[PDB]
């Protein structure tokens, strides 16, 4: 008979196919919390990441829409709408904090201690950076600073391992660079660093591609086009 873990994994892929991502998350948390000294497979770790990404992504999307509307009603001094719009935003922000807290607890309680290779360590520390970053996106003042510090520490830890243990064309290393650059740009408001880091990661990948190739070309290719897209956007906005 199938193991409970086999069963949960299959359910998670059913949830993915039905686009029921909150339930996907719960199936993959049952898997993660059932670990001993072993760690998740590449497939399992990616199911868990995809589930969380989707769950948080719907809220971030809603948050952005509500923030636009709020800024627009601010510009007209229309205060009773502003209050209701902020009531709504507060609700969304409470979900964002809960979601991030779920994966962040899971990361330091189960996933990061279990990581046994360079691939999985970087994968989980970048996830830790990502989730702290999503908190930073809507906080201010002291809470914001803390999220920013947490993000920077996680990304730095991930990058120390990535640059010494993964190839420059590795999708996870490239994904880390992309996000790290976005962190400097959107949270630290430092387009100078954002560009240098994105550019360096792009250039090292190109160099490796031009001399040694890379096994998984598809993934690297997409991420490096994302790095370029951000560089083009950020540097055209600078000269504006």
């Amino acid at each position: 008979a199938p193991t409970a873990r086999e069963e949960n994994v299959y359910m998670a892929k059913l949830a993915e196919q039905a686009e029921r991502y909150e339930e996907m998350v719960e199936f993959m948390e049952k898997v993660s919390n059932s670990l001993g000294s072993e760690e998740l497979t590449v497939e399992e770790r990616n199911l868990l990441s995809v589930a969380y990404k989707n769950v948080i992504g719907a809220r971030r999307a809603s948050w952005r829409i509500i923030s636009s509307i709020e800024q627009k009603e601010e510009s007209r001094g229309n205060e009773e709408h502003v209050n209701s719009i902020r009531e709504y935003r507060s609700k969304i922000e409470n979900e964002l904090s809960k979601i991030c807290d779920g994966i962040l607890k899971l990361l330091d309680a189960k996933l990061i201690p279990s990581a046994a290779s360079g691939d999985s360590k970087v994968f989980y520390l970048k996830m830790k950076g990502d989730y702290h970053r999503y908190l930073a996106e809507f906080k201010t003042g002291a809470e914001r600073k803390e999220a920013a510090e947490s993000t920077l520490t996680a990304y730095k830890a991930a990058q120390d391992i990535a640059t010494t243990e993964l190839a420059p064309t590795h999708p996870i290393r490239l994904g880390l660079a992309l996000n790290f650059s976005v962190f400097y740009y959107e949270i630290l408001n430092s387009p100078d660093r954002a560009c240098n880091l994105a550019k360096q990661a792009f250039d090292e990948a190109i160099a490796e591609l031009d001399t040694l190739g890379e096994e998984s070309y598809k993934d690297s290719t997409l991420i490096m086009q994302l790095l370029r897209d951000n560089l083009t956007l950020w540097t055209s906005d600078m000269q504006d």
Binding site: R64, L174, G175, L178, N179, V182, Y185, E186, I223, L226, D229, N230, L233, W234, D237
Partner: peptide, 7 residues
């Protein structure tokens, strides 16, 4: 301008 692309 804001809202870049992230992985």
């Amino acid at each position: 301008h804001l809202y870049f692309s992230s992985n």
